[PDB]
Amino acid sequence: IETPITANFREGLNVLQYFISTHGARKGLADTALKTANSGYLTRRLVDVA
Amino acid sequence: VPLDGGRFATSDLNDLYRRVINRNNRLKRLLDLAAPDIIVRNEKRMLQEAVDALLDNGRRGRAITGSNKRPLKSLADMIKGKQGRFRQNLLGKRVDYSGRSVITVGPYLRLHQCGLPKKMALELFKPFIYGKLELRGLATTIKAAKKMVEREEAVVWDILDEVIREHPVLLNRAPTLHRLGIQAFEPVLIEGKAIQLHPLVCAAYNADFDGDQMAVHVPLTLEAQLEARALMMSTNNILSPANGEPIIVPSQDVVLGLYYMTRDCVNAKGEGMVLTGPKEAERLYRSGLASLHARVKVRITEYEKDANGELVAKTSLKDTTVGRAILWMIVPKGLPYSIVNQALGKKAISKMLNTCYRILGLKPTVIFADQIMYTGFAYAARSGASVGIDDMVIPEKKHEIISEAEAEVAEIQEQFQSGLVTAGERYNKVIDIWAAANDRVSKAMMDNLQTE
Amino acid sequence: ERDGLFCARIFGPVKDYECLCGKYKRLKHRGVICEKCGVEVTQTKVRRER
Amino acid sequence: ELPVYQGETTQTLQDYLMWQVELTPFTDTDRAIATSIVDAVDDTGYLTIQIEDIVDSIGDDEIGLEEVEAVLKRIQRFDPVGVAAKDLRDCLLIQLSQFAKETPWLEEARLIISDHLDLLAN
Amino acid sequence: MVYSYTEKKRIRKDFGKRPQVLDVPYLLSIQLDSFQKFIEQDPEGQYGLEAAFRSVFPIQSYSGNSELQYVSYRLGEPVFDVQECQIRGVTYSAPLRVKLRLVIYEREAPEGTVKDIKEQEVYMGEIPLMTDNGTFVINGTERVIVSQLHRSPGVFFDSDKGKTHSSGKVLYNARIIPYRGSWLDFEFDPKDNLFVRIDRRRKLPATIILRALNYTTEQILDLFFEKVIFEIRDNKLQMELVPERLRGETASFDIEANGKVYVEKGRRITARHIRQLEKDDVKLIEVPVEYIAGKVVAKDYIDESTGELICAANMELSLDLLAKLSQSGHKRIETLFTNDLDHGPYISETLRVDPTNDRLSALVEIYRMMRPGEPPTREAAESLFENLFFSEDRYDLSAVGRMKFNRSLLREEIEGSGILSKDDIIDVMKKLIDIRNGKGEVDDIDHLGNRRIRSVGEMAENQFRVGLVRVERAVKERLSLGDLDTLMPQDMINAKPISAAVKEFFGSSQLSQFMDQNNPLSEITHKRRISALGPGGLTRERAGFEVRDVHPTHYGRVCPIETPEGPNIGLINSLSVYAQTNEYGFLETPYRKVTDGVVTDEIHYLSAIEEGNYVIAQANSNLDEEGHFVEDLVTCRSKGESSLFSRDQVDYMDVSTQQVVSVGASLIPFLEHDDANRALMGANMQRQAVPTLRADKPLVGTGMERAVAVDSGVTAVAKRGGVVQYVDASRIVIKVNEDEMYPGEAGIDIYNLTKYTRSNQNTCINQMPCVSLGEPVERGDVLADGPSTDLGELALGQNMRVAFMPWNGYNFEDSILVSERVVQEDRFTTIHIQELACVSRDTKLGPEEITADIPNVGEAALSKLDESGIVYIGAEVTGGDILVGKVTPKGETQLTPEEKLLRAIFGEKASDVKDSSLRVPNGVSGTVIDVQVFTRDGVEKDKRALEIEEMQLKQAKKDLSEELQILEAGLFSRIRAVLVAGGVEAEKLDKLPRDRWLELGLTDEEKQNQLEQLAEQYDELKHEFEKKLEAKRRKITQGDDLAPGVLKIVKVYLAVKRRIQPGDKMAGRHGNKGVISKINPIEDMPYDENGTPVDIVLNPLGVPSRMNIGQILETHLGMAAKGIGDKINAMLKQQQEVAKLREFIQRAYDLGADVRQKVDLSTFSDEEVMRLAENLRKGMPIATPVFDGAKEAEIKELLKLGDLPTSGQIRLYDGRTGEQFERPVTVGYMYMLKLNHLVDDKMHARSTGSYSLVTQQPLGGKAQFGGQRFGEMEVWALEAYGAAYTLQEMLTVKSDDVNGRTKMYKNIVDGNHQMEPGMPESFNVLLKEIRSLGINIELED
């Protein structure tokens, strides 16, 4: 997005900035919650092979 | 499978059996009467389909149960898959004890000790209590021992404390993806309903005590105890198997405490004076001198192991603070004094622990890490650790930089609307300008916050 | 029932030392087969093996 | 949610009498006798058959009749005391001998039970 | 002025800079207004039960001329009330009685009616009724149904770009999903083929639907393709040229246009040449013969002289054929453009692939597609193709979907029929071809304007239809057999299918589950949750990465910051504070109409689509008093993006800052000062709280707490109430004013408070009155406070003095240090409530009765039991104690003198009854609060049931007789007033009424008639009272239905108190997620210069990484509010005048900003100020909105006013050494919450127990103690240690090897400590399971 966020948490954030950061937070949470199955499958394969 | 009352439907495993049995009976009955060819062929085809569904269902037909659309499990469905027999049989056996208690933190425990509740340490060690009661003659029979345990007499707790004294117990967190997941410790009789964990070992367990539980297992045979004491203690897994660097490094509190303990502002109280070494701890408590004091000369004796076979002592005058001397008081003789001078950062503590382990051994570096955790939990709590909204300093030039960036973006979009710049650039240039503005703002913030 | 699922004389025995008939019980007969009931007098734990 | 609905193996006053046998110290021969004795125990709590019956069912003429008595004299102080009693009366004798002699009329009650139950029947 | 009574007791200061223009809605209209129209009688058959009745209204027999009509339906009053269904255990529903009309037509006569049977109505099932709060009483439990967010029916053009084909191929497809029926797809192919896919089945030749619809090849070539021009005269090969039709194609040579050449041959085509050719007139121009091979014939032609099969349709032109067709007799041959630069045919290539061309050979393929065998006999294929999605029997597709489909094709007509025609599919395929060639853009699946939400009403109507069609067929199949009969229509109607369907829908469903009772904020959120899993929409949580993601359209429709932390994050959503639902089914959001730069007070609800074409401004913008914008450049959204625009292009503005946040996260103070994910997980953690003994209002809030507590319905709101006359711990009465009640009523309102009732979450609920005596309550005010409520404001947690400092490491990363004063004051102490039920379980061996005379147990355990078998209320029970004495009789015995001895000696035992008592589980210490017992009709075993029966009878009779006494007093006053000036002294009526002496000599003209009328009214009132009492007593002991095999059920409730202890998950509303480690005593805790110690100690290491400056701001604001409260308490204790206190309060309330105007002495009468100040003396409540909270300068000003430091830090001393702490730490109060994760249930311990029948392995749960899951990741760790013996003893002598674990136990008891490997039972089970098949495995040696 062209317009970045220029408001820290000490001076408060506006509505558009928080709404935009909500997307990145949701993406990060989904990635951290869905990478565990891939890590477990990789460990399963590495143990079963060696 | 009695579900509710006289429910003897025997579903998902015997329905196919009775179906095949009745199909075979009807086929035999029809063959005994010389039935027509088409009818017996259809009956044999139905029997073949039933046998195929019984041996391995899901490949053809997908025979469902009359109850709901739930596909019943055949003789092969209970073998393969995540719900198969090879999951429970192979590395799926449940244990009796299994722990399952809430884990907490404890600052008074040792690296090779763990706190277990008295109620949990009584149900698990029940056969041991029965054996001790039968040996000491307090319980003439097994029934008497059970009755004494169920009543929780006074001598029962003393016998439990006598028995659980030297019996190791291996505790592990449920999510484990390495070797340091399972480690053994020594039980400690503590009240409450929470298993106390050592603060330094948390890095190995990757726990923050935000609500996670802990599993506990008690070995029985002597060889299991030997394997837990000589191969599964925290005092043996100090280094990481994946790297070799010390994984027992302290947490945020101890590092912050050790960092704040060795500082000096400009010329704080107790500056410029000369004194002894370990004696400097008296001026701290007696308010005669602050722990932060530069240009302070102290007498430091260094036991260097440069000579092959034995170490030699060296006495000289050094320039240091009071906190560094107080830290050196607990520092072993083998380690030099130049290691506690560089403000003792996070990387510095790990390097010091590694050098101590590689030069002086395992027990010395373990005791030194324990003393480090102690003095950290003490000084971080006592001296300077705090937080406030006034601590966040905002640079004054931030508004000017934002206004300049906005003016630059306005000029860029004006040039774009004029027809000299395309959309592709009218975008990349704005991104670059905002990145430069953010970098500038970060610099101006670090200029006013760091060493200002 | 007779000659069915969970039946006697097949698929395993019944209560350790008591025939389904009611004769040759009380550990007085180890491995005999009665004429009224063809149920062995073995332990019930062997029912998971036949 | 597999083959077995849940599946649970209830204990019962037969398995509970067997549990105790293991813990207690007997020899290899005394162990067999005891196994045989507890087989004879019923839901009510009484050795079903007889004393000499167990001796005759063990097929070995050697083993004395007191041999079983010796074992059977210790199995009936197990969990519920008075288990495996001998004809709804030795129960009282075993149950009474158990608690202390400081009870008020233990003498009297012992004397009653010993030979004077027929009279109490009326 | 607030002009409120419940608010004047404690006024919360607000800092909202922007005024509110729209009040907070009921917040429960999504569940209340949806079920209303489904049960409300509507005149027109639009929706509800009328739409379901009219859908299957025509019921005609098979050539029988019989029809069944209806007039209307009606619902009767429920048998039981709302509380009676929860006590007994029956569902709360109303019977559906509908009138019918059976009119049979006389055969052999056109429309001959002989008689009608429209004189008896029929009952069709019991329909559940929703309460006023939005829950049901299904099976005596409170259940909630969640609305389903699913893609709206219609046509959607998907992109399908990426690795779908691994070649950079964007296969554009078109799918249509009706509400009911079969689906239809138009998936693409890398070979440029529009393969058809019906119900995700096998592929299709892509043109079967075209040939099955009577469309021939020539019709397809004429419709989907256009023939521009073709002419041949004396082998000239002259054809017209249109520049607009075809252009941009390079020509080889021979390019002349009637003499002068416009486009030079052999050169690249340019726009100038096209313009010059279009400017001049164009005629038939000659073309080379090489272009004939490239063209394709569209329509087949034949010679007029010979009817040969030459010149087939859809075939490339051949040279040898050409020389023949030129003399065949056809001068004009239809051709195609085939300009691949702009137009892609994609049809002519697919026509030759189809092996079938006839209509019959095409309609048999669709039947062979669905059926593998059974070839159609010229009647099965056509019937299957017509009944699939053309018969309207099962193709009614939610005509809202028809409107959505017409909107996609730019059709102006939105009203149409459910079934579509050939033109619809033709237009869909044409639009797909245009999108493939390039036109417009594809649709968005994640767009809210493309997906709808089905509430409880739509699902209930769907269910009811599915249950009623079963009846249609039934009645239809019954009217065919035995038509010559004059019986009533009762035999044909059978409500069993309808009842079974509605039961299966309401009782147990995937989207209908129990609701949490604790922290009624959770109740409100659950009543507003929206799920995706279930029938339709998404199948599992792992459907896709982009589906469960935040969308820009989620601005004012759903709540993005509120989502479960579980693996199903993104699928569960929460409605906003101002979100609504369209009549079609989509979502809406309100905006303020802005015209010519000024803002109008009118509001308009725009949907997701309507909000995309207009410009909408933001709420946090400057605005003048007259409505003009202060700054010319305003930030606003034009199309999905926020940019700067002028004050004229703006069309709408937001309503408030609370529009983009739901009520679950809006209560979070300083939401903008916290991290996105932190506040996200904190909003969810808010719903996991538990009430305590005393509720304490938050010193800092948002103001929405009042509305939440009001709309939650857990409190006791007042309706049409006036002056209060009597209050009690469980009963309140209110006397309504004379100008409010309607005539013919006494004018009293009763309120029964819920006292210690078991909740669905094993917790307690309780209500207490807020008024004392003689206080007037207006309409809409609160009367009592339920759980976690204080003075009408939601009070979940408590305000505790917090600090941010390490203390000997007892405040680690996520641990919290708690003082001892917290335990002494019983803070955060909760009460749990459990229930134990026992049934008689009648069997073959006679019945079972409770007599409290069970043998094998002394009088010690029976001392707490009553003469019937239950224990007395109030008695304490610790561990396994006998609560209900139940016996099970055994089979009879013979004479058996041996056993008859003990039978006659010991009384009446004789092995007749067992000891099957209640026998509660292992050690639990608690008390009994109340019991419950049910008994079927026809049983007189009520030994003590009459006690609770008489108690309920007296409880009802009290409130019944209150109104009777009020009416009798009114009638007596009327009698005393009618005898005035009639010659009656005051001493006569005072001593005894005596029926006014029967009006002996009062007036002798009208007094007699007055006395007669008064006596008649008194007799009528007495009769009504007697009838009401009789009906109430009959309804109380009417009886409850029980299980067939169960004779009577007895339930006993237990209540336990649980306090704080190490291991409790205490966390605030900012994401603290901390636990308890150790309780520090009083003197050990640090203190200030005044000697006041802190109660809560946190970790200061959390704030830097976990960005939660909001919690620190809340702490500073709470410190300021407590400073103000301490000053007020000092001014109250030092006994100052009322004027000084009033001045101080007005000054503290009127400074900070221009947010509002509030001044005392205007409404208060110098007496309300004292009671108002006596409530906020422990702290001053402060309200801060979501995105318009208070600034740091205001906090500093309030701190300076409350005689507190500006920064917030203060010097503290050590409670162990007494030394001053350098670097002063911030001090202040904070609102802490207690979660439901105590160690009282998480703790588990077992050494031995019961094992399963298969493989002899323990269980996994807590009840019936079982071991935990020893996964592969634990043993794999042990392999890296080399502990072979440890793994062996862990896997052999702990779970399997029944003899091995017994030998291990024996050796541990004896002290041998020896083990054996034996053999695992699971391995033998696996061998036995494998040997069942044709696999031979054995153990050799």
Numbering used by the authors:
A (entry chain D): 755 to 804
B (entry chain D): 253 to 704
C (entry chain D): 52 to 101
D (entry chain M): 108 to 229
E (entry chain C): 1 to 1341
Question: Any passages from the paper?
Answer:
Structural models were obtained on the basis of RPc1 and RPc2 reconstructions, while the reconstructions from RPi were insufficient to build detailed models. The structures are similar except in their relative orientations to RNAP and the degrees of distortions of DNA around −11, suggesting the existence of a range of conformations in RPc with varying DNA orientations. Notably, promoter DNA consensus sequences interact extensively with σ54, via ELH-HTH and the RpoN domain as well as RI. The flipped-out base of T−12 of the T-strand is stabilized by interactions with S335 of σ54 RIII-ELH. In the RPc structure, we could observe density for σ54 RI-H1 (residues 15 to 28) with P17 N-capping the RI-H1, causing a sharp turn away from RNAP and into the DNA double helix. M15 was observed near the −11 melted base. This raises the possibility that σ54 RI N-terminal peptide (residues 1 to 14), although unable to be resolved, probably due to flexibility, could have threaded through the DNA to the opposite side of the DNA from RNAP. Here, we show in σ54-dependent transcription that the nucleation of transcription bubble occurs in RPc, due to the interactions between DNA and σ54, although activator binding further promotes/stabilizes the −12/−11 DNA distortion. This DNA melting nucleation event involves base flipping and subsequent capture by σ54 residues (tip of RI-H1) at −12 position. Unlike the σ70-dependent RPc that converts to RPo readily, the initial −12/−11 DNA opening and the following RPc engagement with the activator in the σ54 system are insufficient for RPo formation.
